[PDB]
Amino acid sequence: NASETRKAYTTKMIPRSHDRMKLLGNFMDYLMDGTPIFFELWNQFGGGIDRDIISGTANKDKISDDLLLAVNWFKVMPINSKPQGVSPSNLANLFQQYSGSEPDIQAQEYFASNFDTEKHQWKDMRVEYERLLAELQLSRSDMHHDLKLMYKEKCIGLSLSTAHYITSVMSYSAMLENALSPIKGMTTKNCKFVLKQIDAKNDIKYENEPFGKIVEGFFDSVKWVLHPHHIGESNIKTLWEDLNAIHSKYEEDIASLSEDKKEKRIKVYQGDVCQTINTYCEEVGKEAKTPLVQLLRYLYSRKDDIAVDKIIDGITFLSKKHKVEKQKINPVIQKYPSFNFGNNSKLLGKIISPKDKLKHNLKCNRNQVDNYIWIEIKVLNTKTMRWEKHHYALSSTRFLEEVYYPATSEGLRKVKKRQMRLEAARQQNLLPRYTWGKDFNINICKRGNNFEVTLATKVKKKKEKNYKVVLGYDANIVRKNTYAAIEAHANGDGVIDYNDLPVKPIESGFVTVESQVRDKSYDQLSYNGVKLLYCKPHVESRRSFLEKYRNGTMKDNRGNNIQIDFMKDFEAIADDETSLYYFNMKYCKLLQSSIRNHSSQAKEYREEIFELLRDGKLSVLKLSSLSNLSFVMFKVAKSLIGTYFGHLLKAPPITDEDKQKADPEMFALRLALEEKRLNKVKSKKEVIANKIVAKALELRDKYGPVLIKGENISDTTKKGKKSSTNSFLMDWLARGVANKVKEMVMMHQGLEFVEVNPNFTSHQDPFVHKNPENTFRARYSRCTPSELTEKNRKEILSFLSDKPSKRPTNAYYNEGAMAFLATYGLKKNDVLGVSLEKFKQIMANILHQRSEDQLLFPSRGGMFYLATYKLDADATSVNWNGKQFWVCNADLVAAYNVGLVDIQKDFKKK
RNA sequence: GUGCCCAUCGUUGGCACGCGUGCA
């Protein structure tokens, strides 16, 4: 209803007058050097609190007295700091000495919380409070009364007030907000951290610690965290059932036939178990992350030592323990200041704005208006100890285009264009008035010999509720991220009722950014690179590089062979049909594998990485597509360089500084590429948000307010999803997209963001699933018989296998395969046979009989999901048996179902 | 003002965006 948000334009300061610039710099340095004084002083006041002083409202959600008090006078400050004097050993008795308090679990687990002893350490804040009292020559009773009074006005402890009220009751304000900002933020973060840990520490079994260490022996059999997704929590039971069945088939072969042939028996037993676990991970890997075969075979090798239901407990115990032991506490560190400036209660100072800029340009020999901004900032000069309002220059061209241009009429190539383009507006008479208002909270920070002013501003929303329309999007890396907008109560072709209202499918399509080019119109979100029509030299250089390397060893069958200059994937990656970005991704994966094997000779693997990233004309850094597999290219590049460092020095662990010292250029390259990927993921977030909000505006001007149906992880205390799908979702910070989209929702009037978990959003048939009854129809892959392969027939016939389908997806694909047989009359006896050419011929005959020409068969890695209505807007009415379904696009139907998931609640009939 | 896209880097190339606490 009332949610204001900030917006800054990251302006740039210019040195215009050395004397005044240095005066402002001296004032800023004065305030910056005075800020640590207030930081230490407020630490001193905070540490002085004692029990019986919080005996007021006591309005905390679940924070006990012990935790609040300990955290408020126990903190982890940098090692090189005055408050030193305590060690992490005697913490319990130290707390006991203060007010005779018993350290309970609530406070103990805070105490029993690890920190980074390399740079931080615990500080007393109580003997330091006594030191402050002594240095102030004030009685302990007086200081205690003063701090109690301050806490009464919420001026110390948890959730302090703003510097305005503080200083009013207690130039000082701005340096104060750069001092107690950490004292206010880190305290709350730590208290919530301890709450979460206690809520996730007691829940740990505490009885399987023996089995936990037993399984942890796997690592001692770089270190990474173990999680339940490494086993397939609910399916390893069936895996061991099958392995037990095999063992019974091996007990007879072991007790009997003990001659010189049981060596082959044990070899085939090992092969059978390894291949069974591999098939187990692959089949479950089609819906989740494939468990590491190495871990599974290791644990099976210790099957006897662990019971059937003890492996699950051990792995979950390890997950909980190793996420608890890597989640650290928040150290209250010296905050760097920023010194915001505002026109309401901060240090008085103002951007002048356009009408006044025109006034001051007319009084001088300025043509009509200058390309820079002038800000009047109140600098308190020290030499002349007084405040003067001095004018300084900002150069934010974007700001000029946005709000800093008047309505007269209604290396520098790029930048100059923006002003000239904006200059043309002065003579085209198009730009509307901006209604300055002068409500900008300009921020001025001093790092070195420069400044980074921003000109922040506050924008209100007044969010609406009557969402006449809804919108959803996929935000996945499968392929073709997409969106779909659905109306609520329309009356037309689509009057499809869900429970009590006709949700009409308005539109649905892939969301791709438009980036016009001299001769084409590419899409950053899905370009996938060029089709290698002109990029022959780049791939040819890659071929020349990889021609001189013999081969590598795989792990599918524990053996591989080569003679000389054997290839790995060129025959299936050097095709002009393949996209450039995918080619680079595959090449980077191949190099990652090569270094994984060829580790000793890493000295020769630096020029190539440079070429793919810096030196190559079509380098990864230069040319890339802001495509879902594009982030895959950068992730594989990061992993490639990390593994290159880890396999060049092949043993204490090697840190970032070791990488610096070993090779300076490579480490700088990894940092540059990480920055590239960080700002590029920011770019994808903002661009997808911009398109979604623009299409939301389209709907708003068409019909009305539109929701977006995003995905949330925290702030709901549900977390019904496991860490498995949580990680499978949060990749490439998908939430960030949603996050960005809600931040922009804070300004684009009429929009509104609501997030819904990713559950029940995989194969649901839109508008019929959970409308009358659960449907959960499967996906397929429309295609002609002329381009089938072994995989398609293998997959469809595998769907026909009748067993205990633990995963509902397998059962639903079984039902889909039965429906496919009914539609085609495949004669399962003959359909489940070999010679896929026979199946293709039968499909061709069926298509010749029917009027249709392209066949339609179920599959997993396939698009063209079947819907019962017109969704894709290009769907054809294909009859399955007698159902006259619509062959829409799988991605669009996924966009449809990920939307409206909880519309029955997000859009109640209130 | 930072950035993103490009066989070629401009046709006056196209386009986007909040800077700073914890998010995998």
mmCIF file of N, CA, C and O (backbone and C1' of nucleotides) in Angstrom, chain A residues 5-7 10 189 395 397-398 414 417 518-519 522 524 527 530 624 676 679 682 686 690 735 747, chain B:
data_model
loop_
_atom_site.group_PDB
_atom_site.id
_atom_site.type_symbol
_atom_site.label_atom_id
_atom_site.label_comp_id
_atom_site.label_asym_id
_atom_site.label_seq_id
_atom_site.Cartn_x
_atom_site.Cartn_y
_atom_site.Cartn_z
ATOM 1 N N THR A 5 10.912 3.272 -2.449
ATOM 2 C CA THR A 5 12.173 2.639 -2.801
ATOM 3 C C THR A 5 13.145 3.692 -3.313
ATOM 4 O O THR A 5 12.750 4.775 -3.751
ATOM 5 N N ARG A 6 14.432 3.363 -3.250
ATOM 6 C CA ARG A 6 15.458 4.301 -3.673
ATOM 7 C C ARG A 6 15.794 4.099 -5.146
ATOM 8 O O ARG A 6 15.456 3.084 -5.760
ATOM 9 N N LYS A 7 16.471 5.094 -5.712
ATOM 10 C CA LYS A 7 16.941 5.015 -7.092
ATOM 11 C C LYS A 7 18.063 6.025 -7.261
ATOM 12 O O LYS A 7 17.841 7.228 -7.099
ATOM 13 N N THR A 10 24.429 6.965 -9.968
ATOM 14 C CA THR A 10 25.884 6.791 -9.957
ATOM 15 C C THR A 10 26.590 7.880 -10.769
ATOM 16 O O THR A 10 27.225 7.630 -11.794
ATOM 17 N N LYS A 189 21.447 -9.369 12.468
ATOM 18 C CA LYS A 189 21.796 -10.519 11.645
ATOM 19 C C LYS A 189 22.267 -11.677 12.512
ATOM 20 O O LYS A 189 21.879 -12.825 12.287
ATOM 21 N N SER A 395 28.494 14.765 -13.617
ATOM 22 C CA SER A 395 28.500 14.542 -15.062
ATOM 23 C C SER A 395 27.736 13.272 -15.425
ATOM 24 O O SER A 395 28.204 12.441 -16.202
ATOM 25 N N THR A 397 25.354 11.645 -17.485
ATOM 26 C CA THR A 397 24.590 11.800 -18.719
ATOM 27 C C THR A 397 23.245 11.094 -18.621
ATOM 28 O O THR A 397 22.215 11.628 -19.056
ATOM 29 N N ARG A 398 23.233 9.890 -18.050
ATOM 30 C CA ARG A 398 21.972 9.194 -17.835
ATOM 31 C C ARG A 398 21.024 10.050 -17.014
ATOM 32 O O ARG A 398 19.824 10.106 -17.296
ATOM 33 N N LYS A 414 30.126 7.128 -27.993
ATOM 34 C CA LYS A 414 28.831 6.738 -27.445
ATOM 35 C C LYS A 414 28.252 7.837 -26.564
ATOM 36 O O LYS A 414 27.104 8.257 -26.745
ATOM 37 N N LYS A 417 26.959 10.797 -28.347
ATOM 38 C CA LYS A 417 25.693 10.507 -29.013
ATOM 39 C C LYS A 417 24.516 10.775 -28.086
ATOM 40 O O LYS A 417 23.516 11.380 -28.486
ATOM 41 N N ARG A 518 23.410 -4.040 -37.659
ATOM 42 C CA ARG A 518 23.494 -3.469 -39.001
ATOM 43 C C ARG A 518 22.652 -4.232 -40.015
ATOM 44 O O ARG A 518 22.078 -3.623 -40.926
ATOM 45 N N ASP A 519 22.566 -5.556 -39.885
ATOM 46 C CA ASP A 519 21.844 -6.363 -40.861
ATOM 47 C C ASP A 519 20.914 -7.405 -40.258
ATOM 48 O O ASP A 519 20.205 -8.068 -41.021
ATOM 49 N N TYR A 522 19.268 -9.563 -33.368
ATOM 50 C CA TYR A 522 19.571 -10.663 -32.470
ATOM 51 C C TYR A 522 18.815 -10.509 -31.156
ATOM 52 O O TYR A 522 18.233 -9.464 -30.856
ATOM 53 N N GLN A 524 19.621 -11.198 -27.103
ATOM 54 C CA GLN A 524 20.687 -11.519 -26.164
ATOM 55 C C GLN A 524 20.326 -12.724 -25.306
ATOM 56 O O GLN A 524 21.176 -13.582 -25.042
ATOM 57 N N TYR A 527 20.345 -15.769 -28.074
ATOM 58 C CA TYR A 527 21.049 -15.753 -29.351
ATOM 59 C C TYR A 527 21.848 -17.032 -29.561
ATOM 60 O O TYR A 527 21.894 -17.566 -30.675
ATOM 61 N N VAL A 530 26.732 -17.111 -32.994
ATOM 62 C CA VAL A 530 26.598 -17.209 -34.442
ATOM 63 C C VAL A 530 26.461 -18.673 -34.828
ATOM 64 O O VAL A 530 26.663 -19.567 -33.999
ATOM 65 N N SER A 624 29.808 -13.219 -26.665
ATOM 66 C CA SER A 624 28.997 -14.184 -25.882
ATOM 67 C C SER A 624 27.522 -13.799 -26.029
ATOM 68 O O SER A 624 27.252 -12.635 -26.392
ATOM 69 N N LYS A 676 33.152 -9.878 -15.102
ATOM 70 C CA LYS A 676 32.360 -9.923 -16.324
ATOM 71 C C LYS A 676 31.065 -10.685 -16.092
ATOM 72 O O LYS A 676 29.979 -10.213 -16.437
ATOM 73 N N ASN A 679 28.625 -8.650 -13.535
ATOM 74 C CA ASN A 679 27.876 -7.576 -14.169
ATOM 75 C C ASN A 679 27.003 -8.096 -15.303
ATOM 76 O O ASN A 679 25.973 -7.488 -15.599
ATOM 77 N N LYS A 682 23.910 -9.348 -13.621
ATOM 78 C CA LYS A 682 23.147 -8.132 -13.366
ATOM 79 C C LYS A 682 22.442 -7.664 -14.634
ATOM 80 O O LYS A 682 21.275 -7.253 -14.595
ATOM 81 N N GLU A 686 18.393 -7.331 -15.103
ATOM 82 C CA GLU A 686 17.737 -6.078 -15.452
ATOM 83 C C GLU A 686 17.013 -6.173 -16.788
ATOM 84 O O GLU A 686 15.911 -5.642 -16.917
ATOM 85 N N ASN A 690 13.145 -5.771 -17.398
ATOM 86 C CA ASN A 690 12.645 -4.692 -18.241
ATOM 87 C C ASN A 690 11.618 -5.213 -19.232
ATOM 88 O O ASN A 690 10.565 -4.602 -19.430
ATOM 89 N N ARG A 735 16.475 -16.481 -8.691
ATOM 90 C CA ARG A 735 15.725 -15.611 -7.793
ATOM 91 C C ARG A 735 16.075 -14.153 -8.045
ATOM 92 O O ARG A 735 15.200 -13.279 -8.011
ATOM 93 N N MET A 747 8.536 0.659 -8.745
ATOM 94 C CA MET A 747 8.371 1.938 -9.426
ATOM 95 C C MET A 747 7.337 1.888 -10.538
ATOM 96 O O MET A 747 6.511 2.802 -10.645
ATOM 97 P P G B 1 28.853 10.143 -18.334
ATOM 98 O "O5'" G B 1 29.643 9.724 -17.014
ATOM 99 C "C5'" G B 1 29.010 9.750 -15.743
ATOM 100 C "C4'" G B 1 28.978 8.391 -15.085
ATOM 101 C "C3'" G B 1 29.591 7.237 -15.866
ATOM 102 O "O3'" G B 1 31.000 7.170 -15.747
ATOM 103 C "C1'" G B 1 27.480 6.586 -15.032
ATOM 104 P P U B 2 31.792 5.893 -16.312
ATOM 105 O "O5'" U B 2 31.422 4.725 -15.295
ATOM 106 C "C5'" U B 2 31.683 3.366 -15.617
ATOM 107 C "C4'" U B 2 30.754 2.440 -14.874
ATOM 108 C "C3'" U B 2 30.579 1.049 -15.467
ATOM 109 O "O3'" U B 2 31.607 0.160 -15.069
ATOM 110 C "C1'" U B 2 28.457 1.974 -14.957
ATOM 111 P P G B 3 32.493 -0.611 -16.163
ATOM 112 O "O5'" G B 3 31.558 -1.807 -16.642
ATOM 113 C "C5'" G B 3 30.787 -1.700 -17.829
ATOM 114 C "C4'" G B 3 29.512 -2.498 -17.733
ATOM 115 C "C3'" G B 3 29.193 -3.381 -18.930
ATOM 116 O "O3'" G B 3 29.876 -4.621 -18.899
ATOM 117 C "C1'" G B 3 27.283 -2.124 -18.363
ATOM 118 P P C B 4 30.284 -5.348 -20.271
ATOM 119 O "O5'" C B 4 28.898 -5.871 -20.854
ATOM 120 C "C5'" C B 4 28.123 -6.820 -20.138
ATOM 121 C "C4'" C B 4 26.823 -7.125 -20.840
ATOM 122 C "C3'" C B 4 26.924 -7.426 -22.324
ATOM 123 O "O3'" C B 4 27.332 -8.750 -22.601
ATOM 124 C "C1'" C B 4 25.203 -5.867 -21.974
ATOM 125 P P C B 5 28.245 -9.050 -23.886
ATOM 126 O "O5'" C B 5 27.244 -8.882 -25.116
ATOM 127 C "C5'" C B 5 26.037 -9.629 -25.193
ATOM 128 C "C4'" C B 5 25.305 -9.374 -26.486
ATOM 129 C "C3'" C B 5 26.171 -9.354 -27.736
ATOM 130 O "O3'" C B 5 26.398 -10.655 -28.247
ATOM 131 C "C1'" C B 5 24.753 -7.456 -27.719
ATOM 132 P P C B 6 27.860 -11.102 -28.739
ATOM 133 O "O5'" C B 6 27.913 -10.624 -30.258
ATOM 134 C "C5'" C B 6 26.807 -10.839 -31.129
ATOM 135 C "C4'" C B 6 26.897 -9.992 -32.374
ATOM 136 C "C3'" C B 6 28.181 -10.155 -33.188
ATOM 137 O "O3'" C B 6 27.886 -10.051 -34.580
ATOM 138 C "C1'" C B 6 27.936 -7.899 -32.547
ATOM 139 P P A B 7 27.552 -11.369 -35.431
ATOM 140 O "O5'" A B 7 28.958 -11.805 -36.038
ATOM 141 C "C5'" A B 7 30.046 -12.116 -35.182
ATOM 142 C "C4'" A B 7 31.329 -12.311 -35.947
ATOM 143 C "C3'" A B 7 32.064 -11.050 -36.365
ATOM 144 O "O3'" A B 7 32.792 -10.457 -35.305
ATOM 145 C "C1'" A B 7 32.011 -12.566 -38.173
ATOM 146 P P U B 8 34.116 -9.599 -35.607
ATOM 147 O "O5'" U B 8 33.781 -8.812 -36.952
ATOM 148 C "C5'" U B 8 34.802 -8.545 -37.908
ATOM 149 C "C4'" U B 8 34.541 -7.275 -38.681
ATOM 150 C "C3'" U B 8 34.159 -6.059 -37.837
ATOM 151 O "O3'" U B 8 34.717 -4.876 -38.408
ATOM 152 C "C1'" U B 8 32.452 -6.497 -39.400
ATOM 153 P P C B 9 35.466 -3.803 -37.477
ATOM 154 O "O5'" C B 9 34.279 -3.030 -36.752
ATOM 155 C "C5'" C B 9 33.507 -2.053 -37.443
ATOM 156 C "C4'" C B 9 32.663 -1.248 -36.487
ATOM 157 C "C3'" C B 9 33.453 -0.462 -35.447
ATOM 158 O "O3'" C B 9 32.747 0.727 -35.095
ATOM 159 C "C1'" C B 9 32.114 -2.076 -34.358
ATOM 160 P P G B 10 33.427 2.165 -35.315
ATOM 161 O "O5'" G B 10 33.299 2.417 -36.883
ATOM 162 C "C5'" G B 10 32.374 3.367 -37.402
ATOM 163 C "C4'" G B 10 31.113 2.703 -37.895
ATOM 164 C "C3'" G B 10 29.873 3.594 -37.919
ATOM 165 O "O3'" G B 10 29.026 3.210 -39.001
ATOM 166 C "C1'" G B 10 29.499 1.773 -36.469
ATOM 167 P P U B 11 29.461 3.523 -40.508
ATOM 168 O "O5'" U B 11 28.219 4.343 -41.078
ATOM 169 C "C5'" U B 11 26.927 3.724 -41.219
ATOM 170 C "C4'" U B 11 25.834 4.737 -40.978
ATOM 171 C "C3'" U B 11 25.815 5.364 -39.589
ATOM 172 O "O3'" U B 11 25.323 6.698 -39.652
ATOM 173 C "C1'" U B 11 23.821 4.149 -39.924
ATOM 174 P P U B 12 26.302 7.896 -40.059
ATOM 175 O "O5'" U B 12 25.332 9.157 -40.123
ATOM 176 C "C5'" U B 12 24.183 9.242 -39.294
ATOM 177 C "C4'" U B 12 24.555 9.386 -37.841
ATOM 178 C "C3'" U B 12 24.520 8.110 -37.012
ATOM 179 O "O3'" U B 12 25.707 7.345 -37.161
ATOM 180 C "C1'" U B 12 23.436 9.875 -35.842
ATOM 181 P P G B 13 26.248 6.462 -35.940
ATOM 182 O "O5'" G B 13 25.077 5.407 -35.712
ATOM 183 C "C5'" G B 13 25.031 4.598 -34.520
ATOM 184 C "C4'" G B 13 24.418 3.253 -34.826
ATOM 185 C "C3'" G B 13 23.479 2.701 -33.760
ATOM 186 O "O3'" G B 13 22.136 3.098 -34.014
ATOM 187 C "C1'" G B 13 25.125 1.085 -34.263
ATOM 188 P P G B 14 21.252 3.723 -32.836
ATOM 189 O "O5'" G B 14 20.632 2.444 -32.123
ATOM 190 C "C5'" G B 14 19.839 1.526 -32.856
ATOM 191 C "C4'" G B 14 19.612 0.254 -32.083
ATOM 192 C "C3'" G B 14 19.175 0.430 -30.639
ATOM 193 O "O3'" G B 14 17.790 0.684 -30.514
ATOM 194 C "C1'" G B 14 20.926 -1.150 -30.743
ATOM 195 P P C B 15 17.243 1.549 -29.278
ATOM 196 O "O5'" C B 15 17.479 0.599 -28.024
ATOM 197 C "C5'" C B 15 16.875 -0.682 -27.969
ATOM 198 C "C4'" C B 15 17.429 -1.507 -26.837
ATOM 199 C "C3'" C B 15 17.366 -0.872 -25.461
ATOM 200 O "O3'" C B 15 16.087 -0.988 -24.867
ATOM 201 C "C1'" C B 15 19.510 -1.805 -25.803
ATOM 202 P P A B 16 15.652 0.014 -23.693
ATOM 203 O "O5'" A B 16 16.407 -0.559 -22.417
ATOM 204 C "C5'" A B 16 16.184 -1.891 -21.989
ATOM 205 C "C4'" A B 16 17.064 -2.258 -20.821
ATOM 206 C "C3'" A B 16 17.019 -1.313 -19.635
ATOM 207 O "O3'" A B 16 15.885 -1.534 -18.817
ATOM 208 C "C1'" A B 16 19.267 -1.876 -20.126
ATOM 209 P P C B 17 15.224 -0.322 -17.999
ATOM 210 O "O5'" C B 17 16.056 -0.291 -16.645
ATOM 211 C "C5'" C B 17 16.249 -1.476 -15.892
ATOM 212 C "C4'" C B 17 17.508 -1.401 -15.069
ATOM 213 C "C3'" C B 17 17.650 -0.169 -14.193
ATOM 214 O "O3'" C B 17 16.927 -0.275 -12.983
ATOM 215 C "C1'" C B 17 19.662 -0.528 -15.370
ATOM 216 P P G B 18 16.209 1.016 -12.356
ATOM 217 O "O5'" G B 18 16.949 1.236 -10.963
ATOM 218 C "C5'" G B 18 18.004 0.377 -10.544
ATOM 219 C "C4'" G B 18 19.195 1.155 -10.045
ATOM 220 C "C3'" G B 18 20.491 0.355 -9.964
ATOM 221 O "O3'" G B 18 21.603 1.218 -10.196
ATOM 222 C "C1'" G B 18 19.888 1.077 -7.806
ATOM 223 P P C B 19 23.091 0.620 -10.271
ATOM 224 O "O5'" C B 19 23.479 0.403 -8.743
ATOM 225 C "C5'" C B 19 24.825 0.197 -8.344
ATOM 226 C "C4'" C B 19 25.280 1.287 -7.408
ATOM 227 C "C3'" C B 19 26.082 0.847 -6.195
ATOM 228 O "O3'" C B 19 27.445 0.595 -6.481
ATOM 229 C "C1'" C B 19 24.413 2.380 -5.522
ATOM 230 P P G B 20 28.215 -0.591 -5.719
ATOM 231 O "O5'" G B 20 27.889 -0.342 -4.176
ATOM 232 C "C5'" G B 20 26.770 -0.959 -3.551
ATOM 233 C "C4'" G B 20 27.008 -1.194 -2.078
ATOM 234 C "C3'" G B 20 26.055 -2.165 -1.398
ATOM 235 O "O3'" G B 20 26.392 -3.523 -1.613
ATOM 236 C "C1'" G B 20 26.285 -0.227 -0.065
ATOM 237 P P U B 21 25.454 -4.686 -1.024
ATOM 238 O "O5'" U B 21 25.831 -4.738 0.524
ATOM 239 C "C5'" U B 21 24.831 -4.618 1.526
ATOM 240 C "C4'" U B 21 25.334 -5.091 2.866
ATOM 241 C "C3'" U B 21 25.176 -6.575 3.152
ATOM 242 O "O3'" U B 21 26.200 -7.358 2.562
ATOM 243 C "C1'" U B 21 24.470 -5.317 5.032
ATOM 244 P P G B 22 25.844 -8.707 1.763
ATOM 245 O "O5'" G B 22 26.642 -9.840 2.548
ATOM 246 C "C5'" G B 22 26.371 -10.105 3.917
ATOM 247 C "C4'" G B 22 25.716 -11.451 4.100
ATOM 248 C "C3'" G B 22 25.121 -12.074 2.846
ATOM 249 O "O3'" G B 22 26.084 -12.734 2.043
ATOM 250 C "C1'" G B 22 23.545 -12.190 4.600
ATOM 251 P P C B 23 26.189 -12.406 0.473
ATOM 252 O "O5'" C B 23 24.677 -12.157 0.036
ATOM 253 C "C5'" C B 23 24.023 -13.045 -0.864
ATOM 254 C "C4'" C B 23 23.752 -14.385 -0.226
ATOM 255 C "C3'" C B 23 23.196 -15.452 -1.168
ATOM 256 O "O3'" C B 23 23.698 -16.735 -0.796
ATOM 257 C "C1'" C B 23 21.673 -15.092 0.595
ATOM 258 P P A B 24 25.270 -17.048 -0.889
ATOM 259 O "O5'" A B 24 25.373 -18.223 -1.958
ATOM 260 C "C5'" A B 24 26.444 -19.160 -1.909
ATOM 261 C "C4'" A B 24 25.956 -20.563 -2.165
ATOM 262 C "C3'" A B 24 25.709 -20.902 -3.632
ATOM 263 O "O3'" A B 24 25.974 -22.286 -3.861
ATOM 264 C "C1'" A B 24 23.676 -21.061 -2.438
#
